[PDB]
Amino acid sequence: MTYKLILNGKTLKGETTTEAVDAATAEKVFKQYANDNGVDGEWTYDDATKTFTVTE
């Protein structure tokens, strides 16, 4: 499946979808992306609508 990430960076806000087989790999896949922008802090998961979300 594919979940949608929601970047709530204080210096940058965005959102992108990544293809993952499970949530564990999804946490790292997206985390690897947010790093390419400088967004590291708390991470959330919306298994209610397949939407990832992170907030620096």
Curated annotation (Swiss-Prot):
Subcellular location: Secreted, Cell wall
Annotated S-S bridges: none
Sequence repeat copies, ranges: 2-56
Function text: Binds to the constant Fc region of IgG with high affinity.
Protein name per UniProt: Immunoglobulin G-binding protein G
Native organism: Streptococcus sp. group G
Record gene name: spg
Residue range from the parent sequence: 228 to 282 of 448
